[PDB]
Amino acid sequence: NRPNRLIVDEAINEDNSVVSLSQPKMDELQLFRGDTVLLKGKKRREAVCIVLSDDTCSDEKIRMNRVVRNNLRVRLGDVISIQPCPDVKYGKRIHVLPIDDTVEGITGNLFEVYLKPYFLEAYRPIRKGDIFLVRGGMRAVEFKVVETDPSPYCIVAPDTVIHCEGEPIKREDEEESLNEVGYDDVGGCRKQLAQIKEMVELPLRHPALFKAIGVKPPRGILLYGPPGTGKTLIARAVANETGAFFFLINGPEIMSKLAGESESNLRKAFEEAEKNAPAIIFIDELDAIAPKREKTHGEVERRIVSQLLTLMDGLKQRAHVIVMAATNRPNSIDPALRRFGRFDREVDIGIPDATGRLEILQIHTKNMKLADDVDLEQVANETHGHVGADLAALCSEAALQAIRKKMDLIDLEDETIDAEVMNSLAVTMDDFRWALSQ
Amino acid sequence: VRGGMRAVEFKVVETDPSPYCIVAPDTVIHCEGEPIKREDEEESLNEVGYDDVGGCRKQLAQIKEMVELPLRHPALFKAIGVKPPRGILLYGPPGTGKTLIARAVANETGAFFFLINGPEIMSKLAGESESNLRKAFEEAEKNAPAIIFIDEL
Ligand SMILES: Nc1ncnc2c1ncn2[C@@H]1O[C@H](COP(=O)(O)OP(=O)(O)O)[C@@H](O)[C@H]1O
Ligand SMILES: Nc1ncnc2c1ncn2[C@@H]1O[C@H](COP(=O)(O)OP(=O)(O)O)[C@@H](O)[C@H]1O
């Protein structure tokens, strides 16, 4: 019912110019190994990419990274149409500007540091209005294509002139920053994400379904695991990734308000999540609010839990809002929070495995220049019981250590850090060694 | 100059062979009886320094590199995306020099310092106590780069 309509799935290839289909689909569509394609999605939007084959992709689905997925205004699960675009040709001019909130903090020649490397002999196809990301100098810069000579699409070839007229455009509301949490910023968890994903899929993406249906979707999702496991990161991603409205509640934070002023906040919070539903309410250190078991004691401490219980049971309505909480383990939480209609779903986010760390390591080093001697697999292999928060700290320390030896001693700090400088600096295996040895 | 169980600070107001010279057995030394007032940007030597700490070495080496960049090269973090250590916890029995250590790193790094003491905070009336914690943190930020040292945590 249109051989060219596919379900936007996740990417295997992190490159902004490629999208993957399955060979049988490439046949049915008569597409080849490197063909440039025209992709149509929502809000009457389009994108141009290179299509490769992917034996793990299904005939119906299409793999595409978050950059393209945004250029198209679609979320995972959504459907787009694909059409060949052989008529595309070498670009003449190209005007692009950086998105202001992605270059604050730096000064220098971005073109040299970012554009030049990014395009260089890659022949990336671009459509006007495209927004693309480029990583370097320990950060990522967002660029919008303001206009292309062969309009509205063309390939950026070694001859294509690239204008970058010095004024950073301001981001437009409906243009989510790529610097946002995504499923692509989570590693290790997979089965857990698979579960959570399907749990919120319908209620958060197809609300009307529940207006017309009589079945009950899961209402509360509880996340188990030690600190720095990515529970918050996971919840924030599912929200972003699903266009859902997000509202974070933090125990310590709530539990520091004066008696009564504390509950007024819980309610004001829930009350707001509903205003913007579909929404996800994430209670951070939950056990900081609901421990009741044997450890609860206080004509306020108890008055709060009860308040949370009430607020929980208060859910159930139109566009649904789901509640996600986090704690280290069952035992911590008030048994009352389990009572079905409340936190009736549970997900245990263990500690990554060897592969999981390798994955996590990659995610946290994507914006930095790693020397060829850097062996992340080794690093992954020796960090047995680490959790994401650990690995991230490990990367952060290896980079700061690198910054202290190199840049630091030459001394070009405390001023207005130059991109070219930060861009040249490379973290070495020696730098990770230093970090792993503290 | 140290002596009489204390140290005296002296400023050279003028030298004959100006602006520099050697003080030899013949050099006359005037000391006209009026003590000048210290100038803001002239830190007293009677201040805590790494040179007033002994025993710790490896610990100071660590703490030093930990605060080096964030406290001496702030812009780095305005231009960078990495996270510097945020809280440094000091373990050890009483009278180990934890406070002295923290106060030195601050002075020694031109950092702004703000001391918070548990007993002190915990003696304010309910609510009046938290208002102080916030007012404290709030002030350390006004003068950042700064170091907030919570004493008896
Ligand atoms: N699975 C993961 N993938 C990538 N980074 C992770 C992961 N788990 C943790 N982290 C890192 O650790 C920090 C962990 O904190 P957070 O997400 O708040 O986790 P938790 O809620 O368990 O403390 C995250 O911001 C992220 O940088
Ligand atoms: N390593 C040290 N070197 C020099 N003096 C020290 C040292 N440790 C402690 N002291 C002395 O002991 C007093 C110790 O108190 P303080 O610095 O407040 O330590 P702590 O916070 O552990 O009680 C200091 O003011 C200093 O005179």
Test the B interface: residue of A364, A400, A421 with most B CBs within 10 Å:
A400
CA quadruple A366, A367, A368, A370: dihedral, nearest 10? 30
For a mutational test of ligand 2's pocket, the pick from B48, B100, B152, B153, i.e. the residue with the most ligand atoms closer than 8 A to its C-beta, is B100
Let me know if A228 is exposed, middle or buried by CB neighbors in 10 A (0-12, 13-18, 19+): middle
DSSP structural state of residue A292: H
What is the phi/psi pair of residue B47, to 5°? -95, 155
CA distance A405 to B147: 24
- SS3 string, B68-106, reads HHHHHCHHHHHHCCCCCCCCCCCCCCCCCCHHHHHHHHH
Q: Are strands A18-21 and A46-53 parallel, antiparallel or unpaired?
A: parallel
| DSSP secondary structure code for residue A181 in this structure | -
Name the amino acid, one letter, at A181: V
Q: What is the largest CA-CA distance in chain B?
A: 68
CB A6 within 8 A of CB A60: yes
Q: Do A139 and B80 touch (CB under 8 A)?
A: yes
Collapsing DSSP to helix, strand or coil, A388 comes out as helix
**CA of B94 relative to ligand 2 center, distance in Å:** 8
Angstrom CA distances, B35 to B1, B8, B20, B46, stand at: 15, 11, 22, 17
Q: Using CA atoms, how far apart are residues A299 and A291, in angstroms rounded to an integer? A: 14
Q: Are A157 and A90 in contact (CB under 8 A)?
A: yes
CA A232 – ligand 1 centroid, Å: 7
* Least Cα separation, residue B53 to chain A (angstroms): 23
Nearest CA to ligand 2 atom 15: B95
CA A201 centroid distance within chain: 17
For the CA atoms of B60, B63, B65, B68, the dihedral, rounded to the nearest 10 degrees, stands at -110
Q: Measuring CA to CA, how many Å separate A213 from each of A207, A216, A343, B137?
A: 10, 9, 22, 52
Whole-number Å distance between alpha carbons of A304 and A255? 9
Q: Can you tell me the distance from the alpha carbon of A148 to that of A155, in angstroms, rounded to the nearest whole number?
A: 9
User: Which of B62, B72, B76 to mutate against chain A (most A CBs within 10 Å)?
Assistant: B76
Q: A429 vs A352, A382, A390, CA distance in Å?
A: 22, 13, 17
Q: Among A369, A111, A1, which residue's Cα sits nearest to residue B81?
A: A369
Measured between CB atoms, which of A256, A395, A414 is closest to B75? Answer: A414
Q: Give the best residue of B67, B68, B73, B131 to mutate against chain A (max A CB count within 10 A).
A: B73
Q: Which of A367, A404, A417 sits opposite B79 (nearest CB)?
A: A417
Taking CB atoms within 8 Å and a gap of at least 24, the contacts of B97-101 are: B97/B53, B97/B55, B97/B56, B99/B149, B99/B151, B100/B48, B100/B52, B100/B53, B101/B53, B101/B56, B101/B59, B101/B60, B101/B63
Cα distance between residue A424 and residue B96, in whole Å: 43
Using an 8 Å CB-CB cutoff, list chain A residues near B130. Answer: 256
Q: Is B100 in the pocket of ligand 2 (CB under 6 A)?
A: yes
Nearest ligand 1 atom to alpha carbon A185:
4
- Please give the Cα distance from A37 to A51 (Å, whole number): 7
- Cβ(B133) – ligand 2 distance below 6 Å: no
Write the single-letter amino acid at A293.
R
Closest ligand, as measured to the CA of A324: 1
Calculate ∠ Cα A138-A140-A143, nearest 5°.
150
Q: How many angstroms separate the most distant Cα atoms in chain A?
A: 74
CATH class of the structural domain A1-87: mainly beta
Q: What angle do CA A419, A425, A430 make, to 5 degrees?
A: 155
B73 contacts in A (CB within 8 Å)? 408, 413-414
Distance CA A337, CA A346 (A): 11
Please tell me which residue of chain A has the smallest CA distance to B68: A404
Dump strand ranges (E) for A345-406. Answer: 345-348
Kindly indicate whether the domain formed by A89-165 is annotated with CATH number 2.30.30.90: no
φ/ψ of residue B136, rounded to 5: -70, -55
Closest ligand 1 atom to A233 CA: 17
Domain boundaries, chain A: 1-87, 89-165, 179-350, 352-438
| Superfamily name with CATH number, domain B46-153 | P-loop containing nucleotide triphosphate hydrolases (3.40.50.300)
- The nearest alpha carbon in chain A to B77 belongs to A105
Can A1-87 and A352-438 be said to share one CATH topology? no
Closest-CA distance of chain B to residue A260, Å: 14
- Assess whether the C-beta atom of B101 lies below 6 angstroms from ligand 2: no
Q: Quick check: CB of A388 below 6 Å from ligand 1?
A: yes
Q: Which of the four CATH numbers 3.40.50.300, 1.10.8.60, 3.90.660.10, 1.20.272.10 does domain A352-438 have?
A: 1.10.8.60
Cβ count within 10 A of residue A167: 9
CA distance A278 to A258: 31
Contact A58, A109 (CB under 8 A): no
One-letter amino acid of A307: Q
Is the alpha carbon torsion for B49, B54, B58, B63 positive or negative?
A: negative
Instruction: List C-alpha distances in Å: B27 to A58, B11, B15, B30, B55.
Output: 94, 16, 10, 10, 41
Three-state secondary structure call for residue A375:
coil
Give dist(CA A7, CA A11) in Å, integer: 12
Query: A179-350 maps to which CATH number?
Result: 3.40.50.300
Binding site, annotated residues of A:
227-233, 328, 364
Phi and psi of B152, rounded to 5°? -85, 35
B-chain residues near A393 (CB < 8 A): 83
Which residues are within 8 A (CB) of A204 and not within 5 positions of it... i.e. 6 or more apart?
A: A242, A243, A244, A278, A280, A320, A322
A134 three-class SS: strand
Return the ligand 1 atom nearest residue A359 CA. 3
Closest B-chain CA to A256: B130
Task: Identify all chain A residues contacting B128, using CB atoms and an 8 Å cutoff.
Answer: none
**Which of A183, A196, A233 for a ligand 1 pocket mutation test, highest count of atoms within 8 Å of Cβ?**
A233
CB atoms within 10 A of CB A347: 19
Is B8 exposed, middle or buried, given 0-12, 13-18 or 19+ CB atoms closer than 10 A?
exposed
